[PDB]
Design a protein around this ligand. Structure first.
Ligand SMILES: CO[C@@H]1COCC[C@@H]1[NH2+][C@@H]1CC[C@@](C(=O)N2CCc3ncc(C(F)(F)F)cc3C2)(C(C)C)C1
Ligand SMILES: CCCCCCCC/C=C\CCCCCCCC(=O)O
Ligand SMILES: CCCCCCCC/C=C\CCCCCCCC(=O)O
Ligand SMILES: CCCCCCCC/C=C\CCCCCCCC(=O)O
Ligand SMILES: CCCCCCCC/C=C\CCCCCCCC(=O)O
Ligand SMILES: CCCCCCCC/C=C\CCCCCCCC(=O)O
Ligand SMILES: CCCCCCCC/C=C\CCCCCCCC(=O)O
Ligand SMILES: CCCCCCCC/C=C\CCCCCCCC(=O)O
Ligand SMILES: CCCCCCCC/C=C\CCCCCCCC(=O)O
Ligand SMILES: CCCCCCCC/C=C\CCCCCCCC(=O)O
Ligand SMILES: CCCCCCCC/C=C\CCCCCCCC(=O)O
Ligand SMILES: [Zn+2]
Length: 324
């Protein structure tokens, strides 16, 4: 039974994710505040991303209890903890989007900027969570009390498509635009420097004063060509000789943990459109919604782990933070 596996697996799983996630994200928060001192824009969004994960993490103890026991915290706590879940969820992905845009603007193309964009982003994360705070309530579901969603059909179609737009389409569109643009800057023609004076031949500019059109490859220039500054030949020319990894991994790992759930709710909501309206398929999609939600819920403890492995400079700060 899916409910029996839930009551055995979730309480310890969610308690471990809560603990590991709380230590991990609370280390990031106080590393950024004390050591980095929130001077850069990337530090301001990583702080807000850590806060998003913490707002999500603090709900796990109540979900851990509800896996094995009924909902004993009442209707207000059901709505409060649903709000914190969604504010943490939307805040998390929106702060990953701003980090990917910040790297795009820095490569391809300031505290007041960070504070304004962060507070506006928290506002959109709070707004996106209102529907779930409205329709989620503590209700008698047969023999047991459950804190769950009671969306009218119209709202269920809205919730599902709006969750897939903000959680899957928007971040994937931002990734394809930002990283194709970032990759395009890393694709360039080779520039060569004169080993005598130091004149750098830039293929983009070329050398139109001595018969080289802008955009000519150094190898396509004739042997008679000479250095414009000192006059030496083509034979004396040598060829001219990190945050993206962390910010890229953070978005990729987000998709891995949350896309299965987003697609399962899309399939379970519009079953007639996908052709999954039969009896056997609805039961599998209900079990899949429960299984894929657990995967997504373990994501809130992963960003501090990515920083330790992908970030070498972050690794050094974690060792200093644990010592203090
Ligand atoms: C009140 O709603 C919350 C805020 O608003 C968004 C939805 C969210 N739903 C909550 C989040 C906690 C929740 C859960 O995590 N579930 C369901 C039951 C379940 N049963 C078996 C397995 C299994 F098999 F994989 F182990 C997994 C699961 C996953 C439950 C413990 C109370 C449902
Ligand atoms: C999310 C933020 C706040 C939710 C607060 C609780 C909403 C009102 C609950 C009323 C009730 O107890 O029936
Ligand atoms: C979680 C999926 C649903 C997302 C809802 C997005 C809609 C945001 C707009 C308004 C919601 C209410 C806030 C009004 C201020
Ligand atoms: C910085 C924190 C900002 C928090 C703003 C939270 C705004 C939304 C909170 C609560 C909505 C109240 C309605 C919930 C009760 C059910 C409503 C109903 O169906 O009658
Ligand atoms: C605030 C969000 C209001 C819009 C949601 C109403 C239900 C729409 C629908 O039937 O698709
Ligand atoms: C799985 C996700 C892939 C994340 C990208 C790979 C990690 C960054 C590269 C590196 O290890 O230096
Ligand atoms: C690498 C980034 C993407 C993350 C993985 C995405 C692939 C998994 C997506 C959806 C799995 C859906 C499984 C649901 C069961 C099939 C439907 C049915 O019950 O008939
Ligand atoms: C994604 C793009 C195209 C898929 C088209 C699938 C058509 C399904 C028809 C279902 C129906 O008629 O109920
Ligand atoms: C790291 C995460 C990679 C994602 C894997 C997708 C897992 C999908 C699980 C679907 C379970 C459906 C079911 O209930 O049988
Ligand atoms: C930190 C990475 C964590 C990765 C694991 C998290 C996701 C685990 C979720 C669910 C475990 C599978 C439960 C399957 C229930 C099957 C129901 C049934 O057939 O009766
Ligand atoms: C570790 C993998 C975590 C991701 C998904 C949980 C595994 C998928 C469900 C297990 C099979 C369920 C079944 O027996 O039908
Ligand atoms: Zn020269």
């Amino acid at each position: 039974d899916v409910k029996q596996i839930g009551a055995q697996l979730l309480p310890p799983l969610y308690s471990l994710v809560f603990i590991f996630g709380f230590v991990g994200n609370m280390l990031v928060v106080l590393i950024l505040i004390n050591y980095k001192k929130l001077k850069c824009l990337t530090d301001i969004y990583l702080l807000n991303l850590a806060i998003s994960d913490l707002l999500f993490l603090i709900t796990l103890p109540l979900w851990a209890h509800s896996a094995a026991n009924e909902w004993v915290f009442g209707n207000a706590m059901c709505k409060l903890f649903t709000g914190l879940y969604h504010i943490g969820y939307f805040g998390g992905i929106f702060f990953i989007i701003l980090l990917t845009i910040d790297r795009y603007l820095a490569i391809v193309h300031t505290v007041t900027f960070g504070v304004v964009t962060s507070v506006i982003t928290w506002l959109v994360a709070v707004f996106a969570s209102v529907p779930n705070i409205i329709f989620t309530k503590c209700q008698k579901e047969d023999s047991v009390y459950v804190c769950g969603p009671y969306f009218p059909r119209g709202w269920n179609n809205f919730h599902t498509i709006m969750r897939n737009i903000l959680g899957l389409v928007l971040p994937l569109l931002i990734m394809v635009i930002c990283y194709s643009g970032i990759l395009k800057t890393l694709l360039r023609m080779k520039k060569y420097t004169c080993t005598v004076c130091g004149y750098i031949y830039n293929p983009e500019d070329g050398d139109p004063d001595n018969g080289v059109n802008p955009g000519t490859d150094f190898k396509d220039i004739p042997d008679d060509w000479v250095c414009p500054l000192c006059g030496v030949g083509k034979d004396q020319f040598e060829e001219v000789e990190r945050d993206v990894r962390v910010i890229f991994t953070i978005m990729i790992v987000y998709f891995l943990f949350w896309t299965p759930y987003n697609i399962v709710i899309l399939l379970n909501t519009f079953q007639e459109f996908f052709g999954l309206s039969n009896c056997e398929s609805t039961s599998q999609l209900d079990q899949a919604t429960q299984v894929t939600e657990t995967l997504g819920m373990t994501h809130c403890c992963i960003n501090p782990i990515i920083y330790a492995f992908v970030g070498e400079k972050f690794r050094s700060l974690f060792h200093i933070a644990l010592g203090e």
